[PDB]
């Protein structure tokens, strides 16, 4: 059966992330400005917190390949590969669409630790692109998640933020050996 | 229980794809022509059609890493990470080898929608280098595929082409909300 | 249940690997010398041998994204996407962390051939930085591994190396059509 795991991802502007590599080389007529296009590449790594926003869990880490830009939607389609690191709990890997202007479903490609052997899909919800994202992992194939990862979930909105104690990585507010 | 899904991938030269990034940095001694080498990178995105070639399904999107060039076999090994998008049906993600001179088998790393929880392997058969390819997904772990994705397959050959109405994306010749 | 597969990965310095692409753009204050940082990219391909070190099996191939550098730990975190090629046996794909100064667990994202439908996690253990690594794949979902892949394992240690006959790719010391 499916177990839902909720995760907040936030760019707290303190990891030098993301790195936008304009390799698509496309230029705007008249201005010669860069235009986002197939082949721009974007390494990145943000922080992740649990659904209650009270616990720092770890980080995301990976690489987005820009596929297309939409003027009508004011944003971009990327093809993404990245992992979520939850300290000693392990990691989950994902692959699939990252769309700046709408929600999408990524493949859960596997994991480690308590997530070893996991599979299924994960919903990516843009709360406020690019600083705040919210994931619902529909996890299959693994034992019952620990209660610490299943606290009542804060509903996402642009104003939500990690608890002070989680932002500060204090005792009682971090995953065991949370990923730095 | 394996279900076979046949897909045609066609580069219709309309997407600025592929983008060849010559980061391997190698040149041919005596001519200075580019030599394909480890570390050349190739973002890409092509169109996909169903096995009967009557329906536009969506796109591929991803990234190839060039691994080696064989002068003997007149081609290259790539390591490929990409997804297949089928509009509302969802997506399939793959990882593994693309060899420009022979068939290969890719890992199916998962999916979304009707493909959520999928696994197995997919045969990559090149029809024309590198503009036309034919895939056989040996899908495991999912519910019976919709009949619309299982129409009688056009046998692969160099001259095969999508139906005009599919190429033109006419309303009864496209997957539901087909991926653009 | 789980089947253990032991693999040695060796950079024998004959494949022009790795290719370090300094796209993170970070430089020392005065020297302008390279500082490893988020967004450096590293395409790579090494040789792989069986656990007994008597058989050349094939190669690894893929791409690492540098995520962070640690001065305190004197090393880097990468996010890795790569496959292991075992000649005619097939391939295994992996996704997850490579940390230059400690062991980690990768997701097994799938495979082909005898590895078709595989899942689970793989332990990455560094033998000697940067040239030798030792993997334990905890493979689920596949048929009993062939005896040739399950020979008594050489205990990992800094001094271990392939048998000369395996290094030279001689008869009796290669996988069927071992990947070159
Ligand atoms: C992984 C195969 C799936 C689809 C085919 C990918 O579009 C092909 C890109 C992968 C390798 C490139 C093969 C050589 C073509 C490069 C032409 C250079 C250019 O004009 O951009």
How far apart CA A47 and CA A9 sit, in angstroms, is 6
Question: Are B97 and C119 in contact (CB < 8 Å)?
Answer: no
Contact A108, A92 (CB under 8 A): yes
Structure tokens at C140: 């689920």
**Which residues in A158-177 are b (16+ Cβ under 10 Å) and which e?**
eebebbeebbeeeeebbbee
How far apart CA C175 and CA C178 sit, in angstroms, is 5
Cβ–Cβ contact A153 with B under 8 A = no
Closest CA to B57 of B175, B173, B176, B164: B175
Which domain covers residue C1, as residue numbers?
1-180
Number of domains within chain C: 1
Q: How far is CA A144 from the centre of its chain?
A: 22
| C-alpha to C-alpha distances, B100 to A24, B20, B75, B103, C96, nearest whole angstrom | 23, 15, 5, 8, 27
| C-alpha to C-alpha distances, A99 to A104, A106, B112, C112, nearest whole angstrom | 7, 11, 15, 30
Question: Are B17 and A38 in contact (CB < 8 Å)?
Answer: yes
Q: How was this structure determined?
A: X-ray
How far apart CA A21 and CA A66 sit, in angstroms, is 10
Contact A80, A100 (CB under 8 A): no
Phi/psi at A25 (5° precision): 70, 10
Look at phi and psi of residue A151 and say left if phi exceeds 0, alpha if psi is from -120 to 50, else beta: beta
Structure tokens at B176: 């539901």
User: Residues preceding discontinuities in chain C at C–N > 2.5 Å?
Assistant: none
Closest CA to A62 of C97, B109, B44: C97
Rounded to the nearest angstrom, the distance between the alpha carbon of B44 and the centre of ligand 1 is 7
For A19, the 3-state DSSP assignment is coil
Cβ–Cβ contact C41 with A under 8 A = yes
Question: Are B38 and C15 in contact (CB < 8 Å)?
Answer: yes
Taking CB atoms and an 8 Å cutoff, what residues of chain A touch B117?
Answer: 119-121, 140
Give the one of A62, A116, A141 whose C-beta lies nearest to C79's C-beta.
A62
CATH assignment at residue B138: 2.40.480.10
Helix (H) or strand (E) holding A116: none
């Amino acid at each position: 059966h499916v177990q839902e795991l909720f995760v907040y991802e936030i760019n707290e502007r303190d990891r030098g992330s993301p790195v936008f590599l304009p390799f698509g080389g496309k230029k705007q007529p008249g201005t010669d400005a860069h235009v986002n296009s197939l082949g721009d590449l974007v390494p990145f790594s943000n922080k992740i917190y649990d659904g209650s926003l009270k616990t720092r869990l770890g980080i995301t880490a990976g690489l987005c390949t820009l596929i297309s830009h939409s003027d009508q939607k004011n944003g971009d389609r990327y093809e993404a590969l990245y992992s979520f690191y939850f300290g000693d709990y392990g990691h989950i890997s994902v692959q699939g669409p990252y769309i700046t202007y709408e929600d999408s479903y990524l493949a859960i490609t596997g994991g480690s630790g308590i997530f070893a052997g996991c599979y299924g899909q994960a919903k990516l919800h843009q709360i406020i692109f690019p600083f705040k994202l919210f994931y619902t992992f529909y996890l299959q194939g693994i034992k019952k998640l620990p209660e610490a990862l299943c606290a009542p979930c804060v509903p996402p909105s642009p104003s939500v933020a990690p608890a002070d104690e989680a932002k500060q990585c204090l005792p009682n507010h971090v995953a065991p050996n949370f990923t730095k």
